[model samples]
Every structure is written in C-alpha cells, then in structure tokens.
Target: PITGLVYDQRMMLHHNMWDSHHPELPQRISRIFSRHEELRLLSRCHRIPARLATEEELALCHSSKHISIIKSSEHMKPRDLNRLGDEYNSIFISNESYTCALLAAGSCFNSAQAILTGQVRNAVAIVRPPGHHAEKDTACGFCFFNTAALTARYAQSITRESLRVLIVDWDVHHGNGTQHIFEEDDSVLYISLHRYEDGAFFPNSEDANYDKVGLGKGRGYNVNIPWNGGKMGDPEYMAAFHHLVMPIAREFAPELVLVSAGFDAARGDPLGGFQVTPEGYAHLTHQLMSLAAGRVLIILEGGYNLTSISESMSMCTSMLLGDSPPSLDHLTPLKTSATVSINNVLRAHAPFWSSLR
Candidate 1:
C-alpha cells in the first residue's frame, strides 16, 4: 500500500488574520494534520514532496487574467486584499492567500501525478484555500486556482491510458466551477452532492439542479444530487452512493477517482446545517475505494467546524490507510426525500448510464 500524503506546513500560513469572523482559517489544515499525526496515521504513509504548480499547469482550468490577478494580489495589504472580490460573498483574501492557493493546487496536482505515474496507489491532499469554486476568469467560494478541476485536467493529459477521471464533490456547496470546466468534456465525469435548497445556497446556481446534466457529447456525464434541504446526514449520502453515484460510476469505470472531500456537510458545522458524521465520511471514503482499482485522491475542500472537519478528515484518512470504518452508531434508514432525489437524478442521467433505469 504505497499510500501518499501531500501537504506542506506553508499551507497553514494562509488565513484571514485580519478578520476573526472569516471561517476559512489556517487551522482548518493544521487541525486535520494534527489529528492525523495524533492517530499515527501520518507515520504510516510516505510523503510526497509538495511543489508549486507551473504557469502552464494553472492554465489548464484557469484563465491567464485570473492567474495574473491572483499573482498581483499576493503582495497587497489587508485592505487591498479585501478589495479583491467580484462578489466577496464567496471570497476573502489575505496577503498569503495567493501563495497558499498555489501550494494547495500544486500539492493536489502532485498527488494526482504520483497516482498516474504509479508512484503511489492513493493519497490524501491536506491543503487550504479550498478550491472547486474558482472559475476560469474569477475566483468564487473561497477558491482561487480550482485545484480539483486542474488536477482532473492534469491527470487526463499525463496518463498513458487515455485516462478517464471521476471527480466526486461532497462539499455542501456546489462545485459550480468544476462542473463548468468539464461540462463539455467527455473524458472527465464531474459529480457533486450538495445542498441546492432551490438554489438559495451559497454560490447559488440553477445549474446545481438535477436536470442540468451536461452539454453536447458530455451529456449525462455531469451528475448533481441537489439535496433538497438540511438535517441530511450519513443515511442520505450513503443512499446517494448506492442509488445514484456508484451505479453510474461503475459504468464509467474511471482509472482515477478525485474526491472533493469537503466536510462542511458534517454535523455541527457552522456553515453547513447538514448532519453527516465522521463515521459517515469513513463509510463514503471506504465505498469509493471500491472504484478506480483503489486509486483515489481525497482533497480538502470546505468544512467550517474545526473539530468536525478534523475528525471527518481523519476518518477519511483512516479509510485510505485500509482501516475498517468505525461502526456507525446513529445511522437511520435512508430517507424518502433521498429516494425522490435519486429518481430525479435517474431521470436526468438514465439516458446515459445503463447502470440505472
């Protein structure tokens, strides 16, 4: 089990120290690493040296202007950093954010590269400034470089197998940026499980609706489980995998699985009202290991509750290390609402996936 861990201490340098209220703290990464270390999980794995993503690599999913803007924002004062916003609803910046974003994206890419090159079978990338929200021309949702999207593109181009990639985003907010980047591409399948709440959620987009599958030849490859509301937890997410995501993913048969593993959906999360637990995360991570020949990369995305994120991420890391998930204590039966959501996705993707319908 050549499991890899890709992280740099510099990733913890990124934070909104100017505002105590800002939720994307550097401790998000720090606590997760600490949790892993405390559990001796870090010592069990090999380290993959983190590197900066090249200008050429950043262009895979981001625009040149967007790249230049982030570069220039690197040296700005706190007030100027605050001004680096299109909506600012989905963004906040500290002077170190740009460098941290680059390091995050680069480490994520390095993990994927290690997988494609067969240097490692799987990895967990613990980094910050959670991406998957950054779009081509602008950053959105606390993301700058679109880390997972860029990693997907890089994996596709680097592999000798004409590699098909599966990106599963479990963040509570929609990974609208990743969906847009691959919405027209056939080789990469982008699936997200997020609260849509009729598009009233963060980064609100009607595209998060179940019917916004994909365009052209890329149709049906994009999957969205637009969770109807809050209080959702392990049962709903597990049901999602069994009923929708897994079935379609089995049909797609990707060589690598990319998880946008955001723990914001965890119970007690300050931002996400959902109730997914740490054991729930372990179950999800364990289930995913069945795909892509056990080649999966889990990248940190969003989760505001420090304990929840740390615990949830540690559970995911445990699953990566081939540990059996701790027994779930409070799992209820899959809800009827999840059934309806399943049928919605079935209706949307049935034409494309033979595994359903």
Candidate 2:
C-alpha cells in the first residue's frame, strides 16, 4: 500500500517572466517537494517519474486546434510569446510552457494509472501551472491544459470496468474547465466549492452557481457549492463537507476519486481570503479515503503563498499515506454566510440526490 509521488524540476519552466511577483510562481511545485522531503513524506512514497502527455491523450480533453496552439509555442520567441499570452487571461507562454503543460497533465494521468493498477494505494501529483481554470481550447488563469480533466478521461479509457470517477475541486476559485469538460458526462461526477461572489470572482460566470446543475445526461452529476463572498473558514467548509459533499459522495459510490488539490483556500492565502488550515484539509482528505476503496489521486491546481500551499499539500499527502489527521476539536461555529451557501446548494441538489434529502 505504497503512496505514489510524481513531480519534476522541469515543471519550473512554466512561469511568469514579466512579473516576478506573480501569484502562480514556479516555486509552487519546488517548495512542495522541498517541504514534503523535509517532512519525510517523499521518502515514504514511491517516486513515479514524470512524462509528457501524448497528443492522443491530450486530445481526450482538448481540441486539435488547441493542441496546435500550445505545440507551436516551443519555437516562438519571448516577444511573440508575450503577444500570444495576451489572447488569454493571466497566461504567460515560454519556450517550454507547452512541454511543462504536457508534463503536468501527464503526471496526473500516470498517478491515476498507478493507483488504478494497484501499484500504489494512492498518489499525489505536485506539478503545477494550475489546471482548474484552463479551458479546453485556450488558457485561462495562468493555466494551459486542464490537468484533472485530462487525467479523468484517461483513467476511464484504460480501465477494464466501467469507471465511475468523482472529482472534488476545493480550490477557492471554481474549476470552470473541469466542470465544462465533464458537464455532459454522467460517468464523471464533478463537484466544486469556490468563491463565486455572485459571478464577480475570477473566471466570472453564472455557470458556477448552485442552480446550474448539469446538462441533459449530466443533470445531477455536476454539483457546485458556490460561496457568495464570505470570510469562509474551516467551520464553514467542514459544515459543507458533512452536510453536502460527503453525503452525495457516499451515495455515488465512485470507483475512483481525483481531487483538484489547490491550497489557495488555506489560511494566509493572498488570493482565497478563506481560512482552512492544514488540519482542516486533513479532515477532508481523511473522509475521502472512505470512498473508491481508498483510491484517491491528488493533483495540484491553484494555490499561492508558498507556506500556505506547501504545508497544505503536505497535509493532504500525509493522509494519502495512511497517517491519521490531527483532530480539529472545539472549533468555532460556521459563519451565517457559509451556512446559507451550503443550504442553497442542498436545496438545489436534493431533487437529484436522495442523500441530500
């Protein structure tokens, strides 16, 4: 029951050259690696070498035209790269951006395979240039390829059984790309809890609201717990977990679970302004272990603030390795705003999930 670990230094190539102060810094993966090593988390897990996603593998989620756009970036100069980036919101393309993006997507894909084959009980892919905001045909919010989306598709293709995948995106920001990619597929259940702020947040759109369930076949499969701008903390999140996520998850009884593990929702995150501690993350991760017969794959998505992201990542990895999480005892009560958001989601989704009822 070894834990699989995946990461590579080459992923550091994808970064903001123009802004040294960028929030999605290259150091995100590096810092996680260092801290995981320092905490002896890396030493305990089996290391899975990184690889690039094949054009066929990427095509499972991205269009051919989109693939060409990123593939052509390898030879483009810095000036042309700057202009190309202007086409997308919060994107910076370098000579190796395309490569790193493939590697990031591939790392998660391999991590999923490792667990599916019973090579490891679970795994964590620490590559970044976060993918939750990445669209199918273009980049958004500093992302090129939708890593979690691609991995889920790949996982289903290679499985002998009809794979039922559960994706839980806990990033402070909604994973528009992941939801959009899987919105029409009932086999892949996508759940996201994000700061929507009435469609004013980044990747601002009404699609992230609780009422915007799924399309035709995916009706009840897509669940969004949109937080409408509140200083959400552990209590609020834990409340949602106990009331919403966990109940629906238990009902679904998935064969595999992939977490869009973003630490931006952690305390001290400059972007999130939320307050989930490392221990808070552990509680969530620990509960998920009860699902998929313990097959959980954690993929890095979005998170700024080095200390916040690194420790949070470590905390999740710790649980994947079978370490019992610290008890969050005697915590403060959840905020009123958080309660309303969870209730709204429960009301909207209860018709779809008997567990919510």
Candidate 3:
C-alpha cells in the first residue's frame, strides 16, 4: 500500500528568494496540501499521514558550514550571494526559518523510516523550502537543504553496506547540485532529466553532453538527459524510462527509489515550461513505482502556481497509490512531441547502459 506523509506547519514562511513580502508560505504549501488531502481521502488503500523529517537525518547529506549560515541568516550579507546565487533571491531568514527547514527534513526522515521499517510499501514526502538545488556546503535555487539526498544517506547508514539508492530528478532544471554531490560515489545513482539551456542556468551542470557520466566506479551512475527545447510528455517519459532508466536501474538494482518530484515540470508552471500534465505525471509515477520493491519516496521540490501545482501533484499522489486518475484531457504534451523529445534522451544516454539488455 502507498503512504502519504505531510506536516501542515512547515509552510508558514513568507519570503521568496527575491521578494521581501508576499503571501504566506503556508498558503502556497497549503494549496498543494489540500489537493493532496482530497486525493488521498478518496483512496481506500492509501495511507496519508503527517510525519516530520529530522535535523540529524539532514546532517547526513549537508555540511555544517551551510547549515550554520542559513540558521544565522540575519547576519548573512548579500555578497554571500556567491554561496547561493541569484536563485536564492534573498536569503532572508527569521529565527523560525531554521526550525522550518528541520521540519521539512524530518518529513522525509519519517517517510523513509516507514519504508525501511516495512510499515508501508511506498511513501511521498510533501515538504517545502525544497531541497534538490541545495548542495553539500550551501543552499541555492530556493532550496536550503538537500532533503532527498539526506534521507537516502540516512537509509544507507542505517541499513546495508553498499546499499543502492537511485534519485530520479525529473524537475525541469537539472539538479546540478545533487549530481555534483553524488558524482564521485557509485553507491548512489543520480539520474537527471532537465532542460538544456545555454551557459549556466540555475545550478546548471552540462549542456546535453552525454560524456559527463560519473568518475571511477560511478562511471555510469550519473545519467543526464537534457532536453533541447523539447518537453517531456507522458508516453515519451515512459518510453525513455523503459529504454534508458529501467535498464540502468535494473543494472544498479537499488534498495530504494527516491524522487526529487518537482511539480514545476507540470503544465504551466511559471518558472518551468515543461508540459508534463497531471495525467502524464500520473503515468510517470506509476512507471517509477514498478521499480525497487515498490518502495518509492518522493520529496517535493518546487511549484508556484496555485491550481496547476496542487492538481498536478494531486494526480501524482493518486497514481502512486494505484488509483484511477482524474481526467487531464484539458492538458496536452508541449511543443515537441513526447516521442521526439524522448528520442534525444535515449540516443544521448544509450551508451551508458546499453549492456542492461
């Protein structure tokens, strides 16, 4: 059965990276939560619970230098912007900011614990102040801490040696920070499918270069499929996975599958133009769950629009629970067809794991 984990209070912050003033953070998170609550409440077999991810667990993947800076943010200078870049907008923080990050991290902690403990087959960590863009020593892209990386690290330490963890970053922007963090390690397979922009975008990695696989034993572990003006559609994503992701994952055989599930990839996200519809996300969720004993833990990344964010995530959660999805015909694949976009990723990433067959 699938389990949904959440904490309502984690959304109370009111600052964006640039804006000193705005609607409450809780309001943004609440919009998404309400939709999630509705979807889970309708499902009979799914379990949605309010659980917290902890600080110790967060420390597993973050550096004390970075954590210290965020916690001491009133003293942080704009020159320190080098630490987070313009993506952080402004690093303004109140005493409660650090506390909120702790809460966000704890949500993943509890959900991961549930999976490791066998309390549930799959779980989703609905958290905010999203973590994917944050690296080992600093925060960027509005992300203060790397939650999914932290949870996977915690699980590895507490579970088995050489345990395999696959983090499929399906966000529109490359989780460049995450890929950088796990680049040297073979134990964790970091797969990213993101937009291919010129020069450096937000924490930009490479620009559609297939040669940037990991180093040493991690040679084939760091997989990147950068889309060139090509938006990933439902069938394209599924097909790419069957041809690319599944083969590599089957080769790695992860103990747990963690997703940096960013809804910004959903149709009409302001910062992202990816046309991943709610139905497409539902299909993606279903396919990824078919891996790793069905133990999937998805952590929230980014989503600003109220309706699109909420409904798309609602569809993803519903699919994870294995239920009938809402009709998303109003949505359609983006400019480039799913097949056209997927062909790029397949051809670009094929050399890494062609042996999987």
**Per-prediction CA RMSD (Å):** 1.4, 1.1, 3.8
Ranking by TM-score: 2, 1, 3
- Model 2 over residues 1-357: C-alpha lDDT tens digits? 799999899999887678877888889999999999899999999999899999999898899999999899899988999999998987888888999999998888889999999999999999977888888888898888899988888999998435899999999999999999988888899999998999998888998999988998889999999887578878888899999999999898999999998888899999988888999998899989999999999989888989988999899999989998898857887777888899899999999999998
- Kindly list the per-residue Cα lDDT of model 1 for residues 191-247, writing each as its tens digit: 999998889988888989999899998888899998885578888998898989899
Which candidate achieves the best TM-score against the true structure? Answer: 2
Q: Please, what are the lDDT tens digits per residue for candidate 3 over residues 1-357?
A: 756555555456524445544322546677776776676543433444544445455677777777777667635555553353443642444545566667777777767778888887887666777777878887767677887788778788778757799999887777766887788888899887776654345555563344578878777788876665555555556566767777788778888999988877677877676667777777777777888888888777776667877787777777767777555454443446445555655665566666443
Worst 10 residues of 1 by lDDT: 82-91
Give per-model TM-scores.
0.97, 0.98, 0.84
Candidate 1 wrong stretches, greater than 4 Å = none
The true-versus-predicted C-alpha distance at residue 215 of model 1, in Å, is 0.5
TM-score of 2: 0.98
Global lDDT of model 3: 0.69
Cα shift from native, residue 329, model 1 (Å): 2.6
Candidate 3 runs further than 4 Å off: 14-25, 40-56, 74-92, 207-209, 325-351, 355-357
> Distance (Å) between predicted and true CA of 322, model 1?
1.0
